[PDB]
Design a protein around this ligand. Structure first.
Ligand code: GTP
Ligand code: G1I
Ligand code: MG
Lengths: 230, 292, 52, 336
């Protein structure tokens, strides 16, 4: 019964993001920090639902908050990596006004495809209704969310970081270790934190429900390492 | 409140207009790049500007003034060692030739900042131009991205205007060392040119002066192993050719700063070096501040 | 050209060199005279200050 | 012989030195050993300013003590307003390099220097709309270092060619020409009486010229490095000096002797400017280590320290109710 002991540990996630919260690229880190703040504050009470069902709208609130926060953080990381690639790939690049449009477009687009269907009756069969008196899903909405939130940006990140690594080797040879370590710390951390959750979600029988929540708890832990990494 | 309201409103409107104008202007300042030339006396720092600006940028009476000084130098040194023009014409024709051999004594003349701007498909480049050994104006040029150093290479024997001071090339080596270690210019890259290639080939080919004679420290008789000789270059000149560059690089490699050597002369060759200047856009890619 | 400098030097040296005569006191007296005038030495009242 | 003639000069110089030595009676500290200390004091930024794109090099307070003109490194003089923090003009410059500024006592013209040896002037209250260059002066070599106004039609310039000159704007020619320094001249300051002006060369020496006659009078050699700033005491009988090394000294025209050498041991940076106060009790001075320190005229104590890269210029309003400091951070601050 040491859940309370670990609860205060997760409470430290808010402090780092609060302390973290200027340049053209530095504005994006505000969006990632803001998403972490929402995830840290909202998930902590909902995480302690373990001894339950506080209210009918309570299930709606957690469902509408968690999906939005996760997809927002993933999209913001994708945008940051795209900007970092764009900065060094093409010298003599050819704006704060553009950045404000970019940040607003990513966050609003992500929330629209997540918050609206969740409250718009997107679920399943005979077992699901009895839960109303488990975040069950149906109509491949889980498949769409997985392919549009955690699967799609991975290919783009892999491509851009491969391009950056290819350019770095070319720069080194022209002169006539650190790049591999830094790229590994930047990429493999997020990959190892998030791949298990998307893998388990798509597996939907053969998966125990009790262990299922454990993996989704790992993905929420990714918020803590977000401020220290950057 | 009649005076206060109208005046305050007009002042606010003027402030808004001026702030908008300044915000519009501040974008171009970040876009354009700045360079800065340097060098030594008679090095050739400003003559390349004529060939450089001919690429993308867009006196007769003054030129004749330096022409007269040419005649006086040979005649004056003889003792130690259009009526006017018509007589000088015979003097030019009459010019033993041993006076030319005394190169130890003492195309445009050697003359305020002369700023030149040229634009390309890439961002337009803005350059500056410049005795005074104090060099107290060097502060407040930390904003320049690169400093195009130019050093003579055909004068390893002549002397500076102050006669019997030091070797002409040696007077440039120590000057580069002083630039290298400075508090203000601690984050600036440097490009090197080795001008006057043609004269060097003419001088070394016909025997006469030996680098080993004027420079005793000439132990390196074998060129560096990773050598890419010029097409048809004689082996003897290449060892001389690479000797100058290595001497400069030793000071550079003694201690954020990345030095680049080159070879320049043929306006198109400088134009090829112009594309070479475009080709060297490495420094913006090079900073890579996000560790990587 | 040296004689020009020497001639000027003699004229410059041909100037009365007053003693201190409590020169610091004269500097002190003026500073002690304008103690109230200076607003930085003693902060001005908030209403009095035109700025804030 | 010049050396034979130099023997008389050395004896006169020896006569000058001994007589100057004979004038010593007591130290300033002994006379000022019975004064009440000012105590610790600190000031807060009442107003902050922004709008430049590069480093600021110089500024001058208006005679109205409300408007200040500042010059950037991009060649954009802008006339501000202290009360409303609102700009009034933005004059582009023909030369991208600027090093000084000046404001007319009658509040009509603004004079701008530049690395290019052209002391151009401007007219601020002519016709309407755009402002236009009135005259351009080019009768000098080197780079200029300071420009002040004697009156509405006379400007004093000090170039880097060991020459200080007096101009007449209407005719555009040099009325006189002062020489004698053996090195570059870095700064000057006019006197409150508007009759004498002193200039600090780069050879650890200072002079005190005379405008009317056109000849030098005195010479002080108390320092051992480059001199960077000068400012008259309000009484007009003395002037501080800031050097390349941290030592700041206060001299005296009458006694010809350096009185107080403000000893700084912990301080290791360099001086950039000095400026006095209305009562002559405080001597402000900026440093090269990104902050500022405030000294005392007599007690020699750090009354206060202001922080907020390198500072490049200071000033004090004629009213004496405000202090402005520039920097290379493209931001100017106000203190009170
Ligand atoms: N033969 C030959 N002469 C050259 C070459 N490059 C420059 N020169 C000569 O060198 C001169 C150098 O003059 P400037 O360009 O004014 O350079 P500087 O003499 O060092 O003087 P500043 O530019 O005023 O510092 C040119 O005018 C040419 O006469 C070259 O490749 N070959
Ligand atoms: C209750 N946990 C949710 C369930 C579904 C889901 C999650 C995260 C990202 C998505 O795109 C989802 O569809 C999980 O955090
Ligand atoms: Mg020149």
């Amino acid at each position: 019964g040491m859940g309370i002991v670990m609860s205060l540990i997760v409470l430290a996630i808010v402090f780092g993001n609060v302390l973290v919260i200027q340049t053209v690229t530095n504005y994006f880190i505000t969006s990632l920090a803001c998403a972490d703040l929402v995830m840290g504050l909202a998930v902590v009470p909902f995480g302690a639902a373990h001894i339950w069902t506080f209210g009918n709208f309570w299930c709606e609130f957690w469902t509408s908050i968690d999906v939005l926060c996760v997809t927002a953080s993933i999209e913001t990381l994708c945008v940051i990596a795209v900007d970092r690639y764009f900065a060094i790939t093409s010298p003599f690049k050819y704006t704060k006004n553009k950045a404000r449009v970019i940040i607003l477009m990513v966050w609003i687009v992500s929330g629209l495809t997540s918050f609206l269907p969740i409250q718009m009756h997107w679920y399943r069969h005979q077992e699901a209704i009895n839960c109303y008196a488990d975040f069950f899903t149906n109509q491949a909405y889980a498949i769409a969310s997985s392919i549009v939130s955690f699967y799609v940006p991975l290919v783009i990140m892999v491509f851009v970081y491969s391009r950056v690594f290819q350019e770095a080797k070319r720069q080194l040879q022209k002169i006539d270790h650190k790049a591999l370590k830094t790229l590994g710390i930047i990429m493999g951390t997020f990959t190892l934190c998030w791949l298990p959750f998307f893998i388990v979600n798509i597996v939907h029988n053969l998966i125990r429900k009790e262990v299922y929540i454990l993996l989704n708890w790992i993905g929420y832990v990714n918020s803590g390492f977000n401020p220290l990494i950057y | 409140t009649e005076d206060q309201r109208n005046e305050e409103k007009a002042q606010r409107e003027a402030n808004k207009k001026i702030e908008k104008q300044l915000q519009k202007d501040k974008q171009v300042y970040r876009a354009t790049h700045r360079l800065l030339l340097l060098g030594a006396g008679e090095s050739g720092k400003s003559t390349i500007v004529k060939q450089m600006r001919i690429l993308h940028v867009n006196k007769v009476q003054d030129i004749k003034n330096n022409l007269k000084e040419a005649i006086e130098t040979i005649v004056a040194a003889m003792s130690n060692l259009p009526e006017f023009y018509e007589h000088a014409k015979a003097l030019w024709e009459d010019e033993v030739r041993a006076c030319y051999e005394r190169s130890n004594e003492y195309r445009c003349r050697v003359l305020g900042i002369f700023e030149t701007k040229f634009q390309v498909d890439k961002v337009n480049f803005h350059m500056f131009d410049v005795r005074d050994e104090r060099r107290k104006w060097i502060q407040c040029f930390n904003d320049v991205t690169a400093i195009i150093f130019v050093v003579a290479s055909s004068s390893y024997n002549m002397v500076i205007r102050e006669d019997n001071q030091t070797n002409r090339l040696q007077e440039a080596l120590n000057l580069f060392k002083s630039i290298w270690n400075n508090r203000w210019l601690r984050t600036i890259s440097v490009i090197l040119f080795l001008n006057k290639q043609d004269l060097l080939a003419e001088k070394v080919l016909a025997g006469k002066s030996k680098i080993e004679d004027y420079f005793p420290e000439f132990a390196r008789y074998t060129t560096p192993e990773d050598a890419t000789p010029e097409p048809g270059e004689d082996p003897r000149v290449t060892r001389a050719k690479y000797f100058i560059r290595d001497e400069f690089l030793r000071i550079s490699t003694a201690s954020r700063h990345y030095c680049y050597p080159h070879f320049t002369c043929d306006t198109e060759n400088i134009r090829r070096v112009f594309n070479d200047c475009r080709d060297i856009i490495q420094r913006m890619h090079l900073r890579q501040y996000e560790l990587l | 050209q040296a004689r020009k400098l020497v001639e000027q030097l003699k004229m410059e040296a041909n100037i009365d060199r007053i003693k201190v005569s409590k020169a610091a006191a004269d500097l002190m007296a003026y500073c002690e005279a304008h103690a109230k005038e200076d607003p930085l030495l003693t902060p001005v009242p908030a209403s009095e200050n035109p700025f804030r | 012989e010049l050396d034979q003639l130099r023997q008389e000069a050395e004896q006169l110089k020896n006569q000058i030195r001994d007589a100057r030595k004979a004038c010593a009676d007591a130290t300033l500290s002994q006379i000022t050993n019975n004064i009440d200390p000012v105590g610790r004091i600190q000031m807060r930024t009442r107003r902050t300013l922004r709008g430049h794109l590069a480093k600021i090099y110089a500024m001058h307070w208006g005679t109205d003590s409300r408007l200040l003109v500042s010059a950037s490194q991009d060649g954009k003089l802008i006339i501000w307003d202290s009360y409303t923090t609102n700009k009034v003009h933005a004059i582009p410059l023909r030369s991208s390099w600027v090093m000084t500024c000046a404001y007319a006592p009658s509040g009509n013209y603004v004079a701008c220097g530049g690395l290019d040896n052209i002391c151009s002037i401007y007219n601020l209250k002519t016709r309407e709309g755009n402002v236009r260059v009135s005259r351009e002066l080019a009768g000098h070599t080197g780079y200029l270092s300071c420009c002040r106004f004697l009156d509405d039609n006379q400007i004093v310039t000090s170039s880097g060619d060991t020459t200080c000159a007096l101009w007449d704007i209407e005719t555009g020619q040099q009325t006189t020409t002062f020489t004698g320094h053996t090195g570059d001249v870095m700064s000057l300051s006019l006197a409150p009486d508007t009759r004498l002006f002193v200039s600090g060369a780069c050879d650890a020496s200072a002079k005190l010229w005379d405008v009317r006659e056109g000849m030098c009078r005195q010479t002080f050699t108390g320092h051992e490095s480059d001199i960077n700033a000068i400012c008259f005491f309000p009484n007009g009988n003395a002037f501080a000096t800031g050097s390349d090394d941290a030592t700041c000294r206060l001299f005296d025209l009458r006694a010809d002797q350096e009185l107080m050498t403000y000893s700084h041991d912990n301080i290791i940076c360099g001086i950039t400017s000095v400026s006095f106060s209305k009562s002559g009790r405080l001597l402000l001075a900026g440093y090269d280590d990104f902050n500022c320190n405030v000294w005392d005229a007599l007690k020699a104590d750090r009354a206060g320290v202001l922080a907020g890269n390198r500072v490049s210029c200071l000033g004090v309003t004629d009213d004496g109710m405000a202090v402005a400091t520039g920097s290379w951070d493209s931001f100017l601050k106000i203190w009170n």
